[PDB]
């Protein structure tokens, strides 16, 4: 309940500042202040052209490594378990699987950039 | 439908009860037919690779015959074991439940009525 | 209308799901699903699942930050639609909201709807326990026995993630 | 010397045919030994000797 | 059963009707697929947390995990289309008809 | 006299995209035999 | 493709199938299915062609929908039953969702709208791997949950599958679409008998796998993906025409060939339940399948089509390709009738 | 749809006319909606109006098929006074075949449809009389 009150108070303080920043001062707009900024010249086309982005595999493997983190994250409570040998062996195994994925990325030219 | 019999002890090709059955003889006609199948397979290898059909690679033909005979003998052992299991479960259930399967008194032809239809 | 907090969070869940199920654009669909995942995480926290709710939060944030990067990379049109720039998007959004309010009115009135199975109108708090689990949380030992009891599951999960890495490397090679 | 080159199958690979002959002999010997084990275990298991 | 169960399963079939009726974009369908999995995860976690099944608590997150292990694959199945076609419209994906 | 053999008309009868050419499958070309089928201008401006 | 990476991929898909085979848990079943998906996906993209990408996208989307339906069925079964054992299900709606999931995974009609394009867009070895190895795990799952399977649903799906497969195979010139629709027809023939005697389903699955692998091996050996090239195979080798004739006669359903062995005994396990008109209708659609098979045999073997002058060069080089166990699978696909009772090993 | 067929078979044949005719019309309407939904699913209509025109066309054709079939069975069984005779259903099948030929504007299709669903209606009638099962439950 207190988390909800803190969230509502933070959102109220955030959205009150922009309302103060907007409806208090005097507005005066023409069809040049609203123009897109291209260092003083007209934009060449639009910004909705598809970027030839080069780290698509790095983003996907960030996702995969985050799921590796999700597997490795409940490890502290496993420190209270009885069967310690299986715990240690398989935590080492999962960290080794992460390292194997990273090493295969390193050898097969994945951490570099396209073009 | 025999899965219950293969429920307690799984992945057994020939269980302990299969050793108490008479094994198939080497002169069984099914084993001879499977050996003929292996010989035909060897002939097909001699044919499709552009070799002489009846003389080339006698080692390949002998290997094919031996492998076919081996797997056929083991499959026939499993087959007759399963059929013996089927008949034994049959007779066990027919000893076990006589109320649901009664006896029949086979009547003679001197009193059972039949209708005769003339052909003309 | 206080102890229906799980009901209210579920209604916001269905509202966000109807909102992003119109498929207007990947960024706005991601926004709608993220609102839905936020109130679903709120549901799981309100049912005592701190770890599971925070995990689904973090996983979804990472995954559709990647989705945001992909739709700003390749899958972009010149004029993306927000919700009203196209007709069928707004039509199916209003349609889904109307059916959502339809079974809302059906469940707050007779307290028993029949959609496939039967459903009641009381909050789920009635089924929650009256007993105390001592000095510990049970889900914590679930994810702790994940490493001790869970041998085959962790092995196949790690192997599947490694195979996912090698597959994703192999697919986008070109030659 | 008929063919201009040396074909890979123009010479008898003695190791391959020796392995094939040994495998066939092993399979046959195992088959007769298994048949003998089965038949005397059958006569033992029912006493029909 | 209950009420939140009804809401979650209705969200699942709403996202299913969203996926099963396309709107000319692959990644939007991928988002609907991940929404269906969100409903599945939420339903499974709530079912476990109601029934006090502690040892099955691995199954939701692992389910979640495996979904990402295919979802990125769907993303990996997008740019290849973008490496052949200019865009990723499904009505352009009709080459396999002869 | 001898046995009839297929000519080019029979073989090109079997050569269509579909077995029975309907009103729709008229533009369906056969698949290939070998199974094989804007950089961003940026202005570093003065400001 | 790297040979070590390809070997790892093959070990992954066989490991996923084995995991589905051996697990007594629904989550492990779904994990094996996901591994099967994720390992078969790059098999189709070995050549890096747009057709392969289209086929992979269609396959991935359909199998993802099937996987999510399977998960919803599993969760419904859990919530109404409280456990995870792979046995009979405790809800009709969970049975519905799992049956739709398995029908989508198998390609059974009316969910047959993905099999022909997927088979066409991929090479012959990938098509072999698909149409053989993807028909084992869903058959095992249907073998496990056959107490809870609704009779009307599976019988309607079976008869729709056979009719739709025959009518599809009547009007295709490409070899791979012919294979896909024949696979749908065999799927319907195989799944019609599931509720009466699943040993008949396993026997028909084994025979269909043997015959389909034999035919795909012959197509790989001749390197032919079109009907006209298949007709042109007569000049290269007569033995290839003899084997394609006898094999495509075997899959038609003619005695004394092996393809008459399963289907006939399907009737032997359906007249015992006093179902008479259904095997007759399925035999009529099997005659339709035999009709398009007969047209294909007329194309390839019984009439020698005109050839070109280039093939003389091919007369100076023997076939150096590796035919994996071709005579054994051809013999098993042709002359397995006198060993009919061997199906008792499948009990 | 499990209740439409049973309600069709819940009334004795050749006794009352309009209820049987409307039951057969409803079965035909359900079949027409199913086939028109599939037709607009696999085949894209060029417009919404043309799609609903196709849906109405298939609905009207199948409803006329069912209505005329049920009607002709009713007056045939009433005139011959034979409820347990499949010849009435054969006559109704030819009536439906003539209806299909009229709505599709063909004659050979009409005669083939006469023969085909007349035989189908007869098979339905002796299936009801002799108790045949399309989907037999497992016994052995
Ligand atoms: C950290 C906290 C920060 C809080 C916010 C900042 C603190 C100060 C808040 C008040 C600032 C002054 C008012 C807003 C800015 C006005 C700017 C300006 O020049 O306005 C001129 C304008 C007058 O100019 P105008 O109306 O002719 O418009 C100028 C533009 N032309 C001519 C081109 C159209 O002032 C106003 O409109 C009056 C605003 C309210 C003044 C007080 C009214 C009584 C309140 C009691």
**DSSP line for B68-91:** HHHHHHHHHHHHHHHHHHHHHHHH
Test G277 with H134 for CB contact under 8 angstroms.
Answer: yes
Subunits with 3+ C-beta pairs closer than 8 A to D: B
Closest approach of chain A CAs to the CA of C73, in angstroms? 5
Chain F residue at shortest CA distance from G123: F35
- Testing ligand 1's pocket by substitution, the residue of A16, A26, A29, A33 carrying the most ligand atoms inside 8 A of its CB is A26
As a whole number of angstroms, the distance between CA C109 and CA C102 comes to 11
Residue A36 Cβ < 6 Å to ligand 1: no
Residue A82 Cβ < 6 Å to ligand 1: no
Ligand 1 mean position, distance from CA A27 (Å): 10
Residues of chain F neighbouring G304 (CB-CB closer than 8 A): 5-6
Test G31 with C160 for CB contact under 8 angstroms.
Answer: yes
Closest approach of chain D CAs to the CA of B73, in angstroms? 9
Q: Which two tokens stand for residue E48?
A: 């476990």
CATH assignment at residue C109: 1.20.120.1200
Ligand 1 mean position, distance from CA A13 (Å): 22
Residues of chain C neighbouring G59 (CB-CB closer than 8 A): none
Between E65, E72, E79, which is nearest A70 by CB?
E65
Residue nearest to ligand 1 atom 9, measured at CA: A24
Closest approach of chain E CAs to the CA of F30, in angstroms? 7
Residues ≥6 apart with Cβ < 8 Å to G309? none
Test A63 with E79 for CB contact under 8 angstroms.
Answer: no
| Closest residue by Cα to residue C82 from C14, C19, C15, C18 | C19
Between F11, F18, F37, which is nearest G171 by CB?
F18
Angle between helices C26-46 and E26-51 (to 10 degrees): 0
Residue A24 Cβ < 6 Å to ligand 1: yes
**CB burial string C54-88: b at 16+ within 10 A, e below:** ebbbebbebbbbbbebbbbbbbbeeeebeeeeeee
Which of A35, A37, A39 is the best substitution to test chain F (most F C-beta atoms within 10 A)? Answer: A39
CB H34 within 8 A of CB G156: no
Residues of chain E neighbouring G38 (CB-CB closer than 8 A): 69-70, 73
CA angle F6, F11, F17 (to 5 degrees): 160
Q: Which of C:127-166 have CB within 8 Å of G?
A: 152-153, 156-157, 159-160, 163-164, 166
Residue A19 Cβ < 6 Å to ligand 1: no
CB H111 within 8 A of CB H80: no
For G207, the 3-state DSSP assignment is helix
One-character DSSP codes across H71-137: HHHHHHHHHH--TT-THHHHHHHHHHHHHHHHHHT-SHHHHHHHHHHHHHHHHHHHHHHHT--SSPP
Test G339 with B30 for CB contact under 8 angstroms.
Answer: yes
Q: How many CA atoms lie within 13 A of G161 on its CB side?
A: 27
Atom number in ligand 1 closest to CA A20 = 5
Closest approach of chain F CAs to the CA of E70, in angstroms? 27
Note if the bond before G103 is cis, omega within 30 degrees.
Answer: no
Q: How many domains would you assign to chain C?
A: 1
Please list the residues that pair with A45 across neighbouring strands: none
Assigned CATH for A1-108: 1.20.58.1610
Q: What is the DSSP letter of G272?
A: T
Chain C residue at shortest CA distance from A45: C78
As a whole number of angstroms, the distance between CA C97 and CA C83 comes to 13
Q: Where are the beta strands (DSSP E) in chain C?
A: 112-115, 117-120
Residues of chain G neighbouring H136 (CB-CB closer than 8 A): 270, 273-275, 278
The answer to whether F22 contacts chain A (CB < 8 Å) is: no
Which helix (H) or strand (E) covers residue G115, if one does? Answer: helix G115-120
Chain C residue at shortest CA distance from A70: C55
Phi first, then psi: what are they for B110, rounded to 5°?
-80, -10
Residue ranges of alpha helices (H) inside G50-112 are: 50-81, 92-106
Closest approach of chain E CAs to the CA of F20, in angstroms? 13
One-character DSSP codes across G147-178: GG--HHHHHHHHHHHHHHHHHHHTT--SHHHH
| Closest residue by Cα to residue B64 from C27, C58, D20 | D20
- Give the CA-trace dihedral at G260, G266, G271, G276, to 10 degrees: -80
Which of B44, B60, B78 is the best substitution to test chain G (most G C-beta atoms within 10 A)? Answer: B44
Domain segments of chain A: what residues?
Answer: 1-108
As a whole number of angstroms, the distance between CA H66 and CA H30 comes to 10
Closest approach of chain E CAs to the CA of C33, in angstroms? 7
Chain E residue at shortest CA distance from G29: E63
CB atoms within 10 A of CB B49: 17
- Give the CA-trace dihedral at G4, G8, G14, G20, to 10 degrees: 180
CB H93 within 8 A of CB H119: yes
Q: What is the DSSP letter of H45?
A: P
Residue nearest to ligand 1 atom 14, measured at CA: A25
The answer to whether A37 contacts chain F (CB < 8 Å) is: no
Topology of E1-86 in CATH? Helix Hairpins (1.10.287)
Chain E residue at shortest CA distance from G79: E47
As a whole number of angstroms, the distance between CA H111 and CA H106 comes to 9
As a whole number of angstroms, the distance between CA E95 and CA G303 comes to 33
Residues ≥6 apart with Cβ < 8 Å to F38? A49
CB H89 within 8 A of CB H64: no
Chain A residue at shortest CA distance from C64: A63
Between G37, G56, G78, which is nearest E70 by CB?
G37
Ligand 1 mean position, distance from CA A24 (Å): 7
Q: Which of E:18-77 have CB within 8 Å of G?
A: 19-20, 26, 29, 33, 36-37, 40, 43-44, 47, 51, 53, 56, 59, 62-63, 66, 69-70, 73-74, 77
Residues ≥6 apart with Cβ < 8 Å to C46? C5, C6, C9
Q: Which of F:1-47 have CB within 8 Å of E?
A: 17, 28-31, 37
The answer to whether G319 contacts chain B (CB < 8 Å) is: yes
Test A67 with E65 for CB contact under 8 angstroms.
Answer: yes
Residue A26 Cβ < 6 Å to ligand 1: yes
Residues of chain F neighbouring G299 (CB-CB closer than 8 A): 14
As a whole number of angstroms, the distance between CA C116 and CA C32 comes to 27
The answer to whether D44 contacts chain B (CB < 8 Å) is: no
CA angle C69, C71, C74 (to 5 degrees): 100
CB E47 within 8 A of CB C52: no
CB G346 within 8 A of CB G203: yes
The answer to whether E98 contacts chain F (CB < 8 Å) is: yes
Test B79 with G344 for CB contact under 8 angstroms.
Answer: yes
CA angle D5, D7, D9 (to 5 degrees): 165
CB G136 within 8 A of CB G40: no
Closest approach of chain E CAs to the CA of C121, in angstroms? 6
Phi first, then psi: what are they for A79, rounded to 5°?
-65, -20
- The residue assigned the tokens 């940026």 is F42
Do chains H and A have 3 or more beta-carbon pairs under 8 angstroms?
no
CB atoms within 10 A of CB F32: 10
């Amino acid at each position: 309940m207190n988390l909800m009150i803190t969230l509502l108070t933070n959102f109220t303080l955030a959205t009150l500042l922009v309302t103060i920043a907007f409806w208090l001062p005097q507005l005066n707009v023409y069809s040049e202040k609203t123009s897109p900024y291209e260092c003083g010249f007209d934009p060449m086309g639009s910004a909705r052209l598809p970027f030839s982005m080069k780290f698509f595999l790095v983003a996907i493997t960030f996702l995969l490594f985050d799921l590796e983190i999700a597997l490795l994250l409940p490890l502290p409570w496993a420190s209270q378990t009885t069967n310690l040998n299986t715990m240690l062996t398989m935590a080492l195994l999962l960290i080794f699987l992460l390292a194997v994925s990273l090493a295969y990325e390193w050898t097969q030219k994945g951490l570099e950039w396209t073009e | 439908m025999m899965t219950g019999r293969q429920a307690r002890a799984p992945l057994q090709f020939l269980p302990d009860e299969a050793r108490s059955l008479p094994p198939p003889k080497l002169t069984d006609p099914r084993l001879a037919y499977i050996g003929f199948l292996g010989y035909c397979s060897g002939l097909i290898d001699n044919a499709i690779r552009r070799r002489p059909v009846l003389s080339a690679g006698l080692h390949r033909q002998f290997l094919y015959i031996t492998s076919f005979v081996f797997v056929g003998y083991y499959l026939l052992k499993r087959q007759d074991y399963m059929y013996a299991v089927r008949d034994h479960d049959m007779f066990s259930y027919i000893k076990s439940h006589p109320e649901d399967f009664p006896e029949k008194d086979k009547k003679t032809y001197r009193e059972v009525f039949e209708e005769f239809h003339p052909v003309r | 209308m206080m102890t229906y907090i799980v009901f209210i969070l579920s209604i916001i869940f269905v509202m966000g799901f109807v909102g992003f199920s119109s498929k207007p654009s990947p960024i706005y669909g991601g926004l709608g699903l993220i609102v839905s995942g936020g109130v679903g995480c709120g549901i799981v926290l309100n049912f005592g699942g701190s770890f599971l709710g925070l995990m689904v939060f973090l996983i979804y944030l990472g995954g559709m930050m990647v989705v945001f990067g992909y739709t700003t990379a390749m899958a972009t049109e010149q004029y993306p639609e927000v919700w009203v720039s196209n007709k069928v998007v707004l039509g199916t959004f209003i349609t889904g909201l109307l059916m959502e309010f339809l079974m809302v009115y059906y469940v707050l009135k007779d307290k028993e709807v029949e959609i496939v199975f039967k459903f009641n109108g009381m909050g789920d708090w009635v089924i929650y326990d009256t007993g105390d689990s001592g000095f510990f949380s049970e889900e914590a030992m679930g994810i702790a026995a994940l490493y001790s009891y869970g041998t085959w599951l962790v092995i196949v999960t790690g192997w599947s993630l490694l195979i996912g890495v090698v597959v994703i490397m192999e697919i986008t090679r070109g030659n | 010397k008929f063919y201009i080159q040396e074909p890979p199958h123009g010479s008898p690979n003695w190791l391959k045919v020796g392995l094939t002959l040994g495998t066939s002999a092993f399979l046959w010997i195992y088959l007769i030994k298994q048949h003998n084990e089965d038949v005397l275990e059958y006569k033992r298991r029912n006493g029909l000797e | 059963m209950s009420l939140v169960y009804m809401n979650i399963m209705m969200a699942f079939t709403v996202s299913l009707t969203g996926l099963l009726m396309y709107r000319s974009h692959l990644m939007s369908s991928l988002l609907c697929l991940e929404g269906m999995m969100l409903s599945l995860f939420i339903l499974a976690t709530l079912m476990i947390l109601n029934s006090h099944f502690t040892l099955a608590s691995m199954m939701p997150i692992i389910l979640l995990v495996f979904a990402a292990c295919e979802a990125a694959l769907g993303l990996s199945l997008l740019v290849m289309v973008s490496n052949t076609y200019g865009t990723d419209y499904v009505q352009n994906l009709n080459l396999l008809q002869c | 006299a001898r046995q009839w053999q297929p000519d080019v008309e029979w073989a090109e009868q079997y050569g269509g995209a579909v077995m029975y050419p309907t009103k729709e499958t008229a533009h369906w070309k056969p698949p290939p035999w070998n199974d094989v089928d804007s950089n961003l201008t940026l202005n570093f401006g003065p400001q | 493709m790297n040979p070590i990476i390809l070997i790892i991929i093959l070990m992954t898909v066989m490991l996923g199938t084995i995991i589905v085979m051996i697990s007594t848990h629904w989550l492990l079943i779904w994990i094996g299915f996901e591994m099967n998906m994720l390992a078969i996906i790059p098999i189709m993209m070995k050549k890096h062609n747009p057709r392969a990408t289209e086929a992979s996208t269609k396959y991935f989307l359909t199998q993802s929908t099937a996987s999510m339906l399977l998960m919803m069925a599993i969760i419904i079964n859990l919530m109404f039953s409280g456990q995870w054992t792979v046995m009979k299900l405790f809800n009709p709606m969970a049975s519905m969702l799992m049956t739709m999931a398995l029908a989508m995974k198998l390609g059974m009609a009316p969910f047959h709208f993905w099999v022909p394009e997927v088979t066409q867009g991929i090479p012959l070895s990938s098509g072999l791997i698909l149409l053989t190895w993807q028909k084992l795990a869903p058959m095992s799952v249907l073998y496990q949950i056959l107490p809870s399977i609704n009779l009307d649903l599976i019988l309607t799906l079976s008869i729709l599958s056979i009719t739709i497969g025959g009518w599809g195979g009547l009007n295709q010139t490409q070899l791979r679409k012919i294979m896909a629709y024949s696979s749908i027809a065999h799927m319907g023939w195989m799944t019609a008998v599931l509720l009466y005697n699943p040993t008949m389903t396993l026997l028909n699955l084994i025979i269909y796998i043997i015959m389909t692998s034999t035919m795909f091996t012959l197509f790989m050996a001749n390197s032919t993906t079109t009907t006209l090239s298949l007709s042109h195979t007569w000049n290269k080798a007569p033995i290839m025409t003899i084997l394609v004739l006898i094999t495509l006669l075997s899959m038609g359903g003619l005695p004394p060939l092996s393809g008459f062995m399963p289907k006939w005994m399907i009737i032997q396990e359906m007249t015992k339940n006093d179902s008479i008109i259904l095997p007759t209708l399925m035999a009529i659609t099997a005659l339709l399948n035999l009709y398009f098979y007969m047209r294909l045999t007329y194309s390839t073997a019984l009439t020698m089509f005109p050839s070109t002058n280039n093939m003389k060069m091919k007369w100076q080089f023997p076939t150096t390709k590796r035919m994996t166990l071709l005579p054994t699978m051809t013999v098993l696909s042709t002359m397995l009738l006198p060993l009919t009772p061997i199906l008792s090993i499948l009990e | 749809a499990k209740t439409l067929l049973h309600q069709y078979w819940d009334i004795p044949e050749g006794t009352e006319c309009h209820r049987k005719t409307y039951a057969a019309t409803s079965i035909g309407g359900a079949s027409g909606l199913v086939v028109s939904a599939y037709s607009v699913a696999l085949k894209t209509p060029t417009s919404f109006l043309e799609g609903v025109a196709r849906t109405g066309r298939y609905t009207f054709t199948a409803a006329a098929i069912g209505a005329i079939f049920g009607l002709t069975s009713c007056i045939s069984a009433q005139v011959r006074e034979k409820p347990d005779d499949p010849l009435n259903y054969l006559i109704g099948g030819c009536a439906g075949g003539l209806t299909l030929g009229a709505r599709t504007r063909s004659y050979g299709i009409g005669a083939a449809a006469c023969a085909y669903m007349g035989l189908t209606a007869a098979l339905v009638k002796m299936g009801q009389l002799e108790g045949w099962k399309v989907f037999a439950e497992p016994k052995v």
